[model samples]
Target: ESLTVEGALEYVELAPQLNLPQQEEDADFHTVAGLIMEELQTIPDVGDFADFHGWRFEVVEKEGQRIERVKITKLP
Candidate 1:
């Protein structure tokens, strides 16, 4: 399903269904977007990717340096 970057981040933060990685209790960025940024070590643009736990995430769209949308999907 299509989701705004904000929504996707919230889902990962709150929902356990996706089984995505959980942020550390001491981590600065608790949201999923923040998780990616924490790993990537920089803001991402369209076409960037991060994978974990058999799932894949892609930067589907962006507005300047801000992420506008993201495509997160299950992997086989």
Candidate 2:
């Protein structure tokens, strides 16, 4: 089932547990960074996550605004 944009952004805590893919708020850079790392683990395709490099992803500041979703894969 596709997640509602509202559910994805705001009402995530009320989402069903089994299909609770992810939920994140506009948290601090450190907090958002941890959420991205958790997302990386939930990728179901084994081949896609075969070898996790010591990669990095972050919530960066752009034009005085925070970018909420940013992921960078360092592995080949």
Candidate 3:
């Protein structure tokens, strides 16, 4: 999926267990993206999960805006 702040927000909405607050009316996309990343990082070894061995959340910031996305790759 594309890296986008909007996409991150949708992910949080879909997974209530994440317990991350939805972006507020006045929320900053960059800050929200950071918060999302922080929460996601807390899942121990998520990056190394058997089914997700090479998958990760990647965020890119440009001009104070953030694009949140997922990266998937395979290792030999």
Which numbered prediction scores highest in lDDT against the true structure? Answer: 1
What is the alpha-carbon lDDT of model 1 when measured against the actual structure? 0.63
Residue ranges of candidate 3 with Cα displaced over 4 Å: 1-12, 16-32, 36-55, 61-63, 67-76
Tens digit per residue, CA lDDT, model 2, 21-73: 34446542133323443455542221222122344333332223333333333
Off by over 4 Å in 2: 1-29, 33-53, 58-64
Number of colliding residue pairs in model 1: 0
Q: Residue by residue across 10-72, what tens digits does model 3's lDDT show?
A: 544533534434555764333334444455553223222121222334343333334333332
User: Best candidate, TM-score-wise?
Assistant: 1
Query: By the lDDT metric, which is better: model 2 or model 3?
Result: 3
Residue lDDT tens for model 1, 1-76? 5643552366445448565566566766656566556667877777776665776667777766666666777778
Q: TM-score of each candidate?
A: 0.68, 0.22, 0.25
Using lDDT as the measure, name the better of candidate 1 and candidate 2.
1
Ranking 1 against 3 by lDDT, winner: 1
- Residue 36 lDDT in model 2? 43
